[PDB]
A paper describes a structure:
[name] is an ancient, filament-forming, tubulin-like GTPase protein found in the vast majority of bacteria and archaea, where it acts as a central component of the cell division machinery (1–3). Here, using X-ray crystallography of [name] [name] (SaFtsZ), we reveal how an [name] can adopt two functionally distinct conformations, open and closed. The closed form is found within several crystal forms of two nonpolymerizing SaFtsZ mutants and corresponds to many previous [name] structures from other organisms. We argue that [name]’s conformational switch is polymerization-associated, driven by the formation of the longitudinal intersubunit interfaces along the filament.
For easier reference, the five SaFtsZ structures are named herein in the form #XXx: number (1 to 5), mutation (F for [name], T for T66W), monomer conformation (O for open, C for closed), and finally the arrangement of monomers within the crystal (m for monomeric, f for filamentous, single protofilament and s for split/domain swapped). Specifically, two SaFtsZ mutations, [name] and T66W, were designed to inhibit SaFtsZ filament formation on the basis of equivalent mutations inhibiting the assembly of Methanocaldococcus jannaschii [name] (M164A and T92W, respectively; polymerization inhibition of T92W [unpublished data]). Both mutation sites are located on the “top” surface of [name], in the N-terminal GTP-binding domain, and are part of the longitudinal protofilament interface seen in crystals. The two conformations, open and closed, can be distinguished clearly by the change in the interdomain angle between the NTD and the CTD. If we consider the NTD to be fixed in space, the switch to the open conformation is best defined (as determined by the model-free algorithm implemented in the program DynDom) as an ~27° rotation of the CTD versus the closed conformation around an axis of rotation, as indicated by the circled dot in Fig. 2B, right. Notably, when shifting from closed to open, Arg 29 moves from the solvent-exposed side of H-7 to become slotted between H-7 and the NTD in the open state (a 6.5-Å displacement of the guanidinium carbon), interacting directly with both guanosine and Asp 187 (on H-7, in the closed state itself interacting with the base). As in tubulin, the nucleotide forms a large part of the interface between subunits, and it is thought that nucleotide hydrolysis is used to modulate interface affinity. These crystalline filaments have a 44-Å repeat that corresponds well to repeat intervals seen in negatively stained [name] filaments from a number of species. Given that all [name] crystals where bona fide straight filaments are seen in the crystal have [name] proteins in the open conformation and that the inverse is true—SaFtsZ filament crystals contain open subunits—and that our intermediate-resolution EcFtsZ cryoEM structure also contains open subunits, we propose that a polymerization-driven conformational switch is a general property of all [name] proteins.
Author numbering: 12 to 201, 998, 203 to 315
Write the structure that this text describes.
């Protein structure tokens, strides 16, 4: 499948730059912004400046109606950049003028172009104020109506994973990992024919028109490795939507030749027990002999 990651506005384009710097192989990046200064510095191969008639090449100055109109007026350019995608991840920080208004338009276009469309967006820090939060909430609601599945990261959760000295840019990279892991997990599932295979049609069944989503990867080794990996896959502190209530799950377990039936069952039970629900299990298994003693559990959960 052709996977694309589209960053919309400042924070979304930040995430695209950091992900390209980190390294990401078979994924096309697209950078969309009103802010031409920031776009000029993007590392993405595909860049779309939107709304230059509206903003004269600046940002949207905290007005989401300008981000929205900018995206609508560049619809054809956005279609052309998306065309061919089977799956699109639209990432954006909600609460500003460009992302809040343009990201739901971009997502709507991607879904109308036939792409499985996942939004990964932030809510602003409480320190940014109540009206930024209210503006962001309208963006989140518009995003939810425009995507297949939505992952919301409240930026306040970053305050739960730092100490008093953690550089702000290091905290931002942690939030990127939510998107990177989801993209990488799907990429890796598509690329290999598993002993019990999952492919893009399984991703579509779990993610299409399902609302809120969780995506996680956990890795462990040694004793209780499978349970530990499964718990890590479902336990991110940054997510608005936890695993509790999932009624839809794609789960893949990858290990070396030692991967046991028993421990795969243990892993499957961890997900359903934390789900506290009757959940939609599509379960896959991959034997990767180069893994030795490590196990990797990938989880996509929906149905909330
Ligand atoms: N986690 C994270 N949040 C960001 C980042 N940049 C901006 N934000 C958040 O995104 C919101 C909108 O900022 P920005 O994307 O620059 O606005 P826009 O360009 O007008 O869409 C801000 O109010 C912050 O809450 C980033 O790199 N990481």
């Amino acid at each position: 499948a052709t996977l694309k990651v589209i960053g919309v506005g400042g924070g979304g384009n930040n995430a695209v730059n950091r992900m390209i710097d980190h390294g990401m192989n078979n994924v096309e990046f697209i950078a969309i912004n009103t802010d031409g200064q920031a776009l000029n510095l993007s590392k993405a191969e595909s860049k779309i400046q939107i709304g230059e008639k509206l903003t004269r090449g600046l940002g949207a100055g905290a007005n989401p109606e300008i981000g929205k109109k900018a995206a609508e007026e560049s619809r054809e350019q956005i279609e052309d950049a998306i065309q061919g995608a089977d799956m699109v991840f639209v990432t954006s920080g909600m609460g500003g003028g460009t992302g809040t208004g343009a990201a739901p338009v971009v997502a709507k276009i991607a879904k109308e172009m036939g792409a499985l469309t996942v939004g990964v967006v932030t809510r602003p820090f409480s320190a940014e104020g109540r009206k930024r939060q209210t503006q962001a909430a309208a963006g989140v609601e518009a995003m939810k109506a425009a995507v297949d599945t939505l992952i919301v990261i409240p930026n306040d959760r970053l305050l739960d994973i730092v100490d008093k000295s953690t550089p702000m840019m290091e905290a931002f990279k942690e939030a990127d990992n939510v998107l990177r892991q989801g993209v990488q997990g799907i990429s890796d599932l598509i690329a290999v024919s598993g002993e019990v295979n999952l492919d893009f049609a399984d991703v579509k069944t779990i993610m299409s028109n399902q609302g809120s989503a969780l995506m996680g990867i956990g890795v462990s080794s040694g004793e209780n490795r499978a349970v530990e990996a499964a718990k890590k896959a479902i336990s991110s502190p940054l997510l608005e939507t936890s695993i509790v209530g999932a009624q839809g799950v794609l789960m893949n377990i990858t290990g070396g030749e030692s991967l046991s039936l028993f421990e795969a069952q243990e892993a499957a039970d961890i997900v359903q027990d934390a789900a506290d629900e009757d959940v939609n299990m599509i379960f896959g298994t991959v034997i990767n002999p180069e893994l030795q003693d490590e196990i990797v559990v990938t989880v996509i959960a929906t149905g909330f």
